[PDB]
Structures are given as C-alpha cells and as structure tokens.
Design a protein around this ligand. Structure first.
Ligand code: SF4
Lengths: 77, 49, 50, 49, 89, 49
C-alpha cells in the first residue's frame, strides 16, 4: 500500500496526444489492425500499436473517445 | 435620475429600455452600464415604453 | 491638532441645480496601542498619492 | 410634501486599544475605481526612561 | 544470540506534539502577498481556472465552484431561437 | 437577395468521462470585461454499501 512517488489526481487534462491505453475499457476499440507504432498502415495483429495522436484516431475511425482537448490557442491568446 | 442605495464596496448602474409592441409584446432598445447617477436618452420614437 | 482624538473637514462645493451625489465612507485601522497623530494637520491624508 | 423619515443609530461598538481613522469623501471627482488611503502618522508612545 | 540496544523512543516522538500521535493533522497552504491578504482554501476553488496545468479536479458535494475553461469563442448570433416566429421589426 | 451560405459541422470529439457544461450568452448587456461562471453542482457518484 506504500504511496511513495505517487500523485493523487492522475489526469493531464489536455494535450495534442491521448493519455490512455490501447484497446482498454475506455478507448473502446476492437477492430482489425490498421496502424502501428508510427503512422504506417499494417494488417498484422502482432504489431498493432497506436501513436496516441489525432492521426491514430483518424486511422481507427474512433475520434469521439479521444482524451485530448483541442485548445492549443488558449495559452497563446 | 435616481439616488444611490445602501452599498458595499462599489456599484454600477445597469439600465435597459423596452418598448411595448403593437400586438402586446416587448422590444428592447439598447442597454447601458454606467457609473454616473444621471442618464439621458435622445432621439426616441413610437409611443409608450 | 493632535492629542487623543481629532476631527477635520473641508468646505463642500457643489450646488448648480438639484442633483444627488454619492458619499464613500471608510474606516481604517492603522496600528495598536497609544499612537501619536499625524506629523501635520489634515493634509497627511493621502488619497491616490496626493 | 413630507416624505419618509429615517431614524438612524450609529456604531456603539468602540475600539478599546486600536488606532483608527474614518474618512468620508464625496467620491464624485474620483474615477470609477477605488481610492487608496495612505496616512503619514507618527510612532507609538513608548516607555522611555 | 542476544539482541541489545533496544533504545526505547517513546520520549522522542512526543517532542513534536501529542495530538499528532493520533492525527496526521491537516496540511496548510502558503500565503502569497500578491493575493492581498486572502487565505487560500485547500478544498475549494471559486475562481474559474484555465484548462492546462491544473489537473482535472474532483467534486464531492455542494460547493458552487468555478471550472477549467477548455474553449472560449465569441461569434455572431442568429435572429431567432427556432420555430416559425422569426420577426425582426 | 441571396448571399453566401455556410455549412457547419459541430464537434465530434465527445468527452468520455469528464463532466462539462456549455453555456452560450448573448453577452450584450455584459461589460467589456470577461464573465465568471460558477456552478452549484452536487457531488460525485460513489460506490456505497
Ligand atoms: S488515441 Fe484514439 S485510439 Fe489511440 S488510444 Fe487514445 S483513443 Fe484509443
């Protein structure tokens, strides 16, 4: 139960990148392999990986479950 | 023109003007947030408001 | 004037047709214990650094 | 005509050992913002030999 | 064999306080001169913050509080909420 | 006369597990400054015996 080196609220809120796992119970993807570690098409289950960017979501046709708020300009403007 | 009521810190006066329509509804003509107690309106038409 | 309690005022200047003016009134606590008065008269009150 | 009359009672709570200043200003010639009050006072009465 | 040097430490712990021996005590925040003389609460944020550095917060009951704004945008509105009642004059 | 028409697509990026409130106000009667939004919300649904 030791709580060394841990922070309580474990969310980053927003970024250009997603902040979850792949094929978990929040991403909610169960389709065939389409993308790999980078933005390269593939069709093998062994090298199924998501770059956790917007391009990965566009590849997987699953954007409504994206964990990054697209603000960007709130810090500038 | 009016007077200043009991106040904490500081206040401003928000005043809006509405015009009774022909059917019976209301039409809002402008609005103003000011600090002076006295305000003046110019170039008003139609009837009751 | 100093001693323990003092009061002062300046002549109000307004008039020029019936109107209604505001009046801001505020109390300030300076320090504790028996203090002395201002180095000069009512001039020591500085509103907006004047 | 006579209008509403108001009976007002001031503060009966006195401050036993704290120095204080009360200032009232018409606050018309000032700006819409607040006004900073700075006072040029002397020091504290000490138990000097 | 023997296990010497027990070195009882009951006295040392009380040196920091006794109420702390049963309660860890609530943490207190620091005071910023710039934020006048107001005292910061550790469990409420009335002001509405910016969605970036601040982590996604959590609510536990009541507390009309602010938020972390994600997108603010101002445009030109439409004349008419809906239906066929679309009069202008 | 007929002028430009605009086809608009809203946000498809749904928020998975975060509570959110979207507010639209005409912002005419408000001042040149921003507006602070507060919400008197309840707590979070917990697992209770
Ligand atoms: S990015 Fe889109 S796809 Fe890749 S994990 Fe986050 S949600 Fe699932």
């Amino acid at each position: 139960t030791e709580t060394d080196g841990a922070v309580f609220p474990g969310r980053i809120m927003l970024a250009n990148t997603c902040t979850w796992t792949y094929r978990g119970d929040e991403c909610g993807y169960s389709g065939p392999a389409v993308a790999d570690e980078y933005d390269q098409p593939t069709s093998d289950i062994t090298k199924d990986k998501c770059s956790k960017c917007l391009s990965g979501c566009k590849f997987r046709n699953n954007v409504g479950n994206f964990g990054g708020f697209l603000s960007i300009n709130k810090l500038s403007q | 023109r009016w007077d200043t009521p009991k106040v904490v810190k500081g206040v401003s006066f928000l005043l809006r003007l509405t015009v009774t329509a022909d059917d019976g509804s209301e039409r809002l003509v402008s609005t103003a947030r000011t600090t002076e107690t006295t305000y003046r309106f110019t170039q008003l038409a139609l009837g009751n408001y | 004037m100093g001693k323990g309690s003092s009061k002062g005022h300046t002549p109000r200047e307004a008039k020029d047709n019936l109107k209604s003016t505001q009046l801001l009134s505020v109390i300030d606590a300076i320090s504790e214990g028996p203090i002395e008065g201002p180095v000069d008269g009512l001039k020591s009150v500085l509103l907006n650094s004047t | 005509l006579w209008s509403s009359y108001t009976e007002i009672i001031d503060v009966k709570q006195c401050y036993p050992n704290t120095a204080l200043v009360g200032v009232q200003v018409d606050s018309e010639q000032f700006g819409s913002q607040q006004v900073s009050r700075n006072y040029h006072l002397r020091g504290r009465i000490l138990q000097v030999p | 064999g023997m296990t010497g040097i027990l070195f009882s430490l009951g006295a040392s712990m009380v040196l920091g306080g006794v109420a702390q021996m049963l309660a860890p005590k609530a943490r207190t925040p620091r005071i910023q001169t710039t934020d006048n003389g107001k005292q910061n609460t550790y469990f409420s944020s009335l002001d509405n913050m910016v969605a970036q550095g601040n982590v996604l917060p959590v609510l536990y009951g009541e507390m009309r509080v602010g938020s972390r704004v994600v997108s603010q945008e101002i445009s030109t509105a439409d004349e008419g909420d809906g239906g066929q009642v679309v009069v202008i004059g």
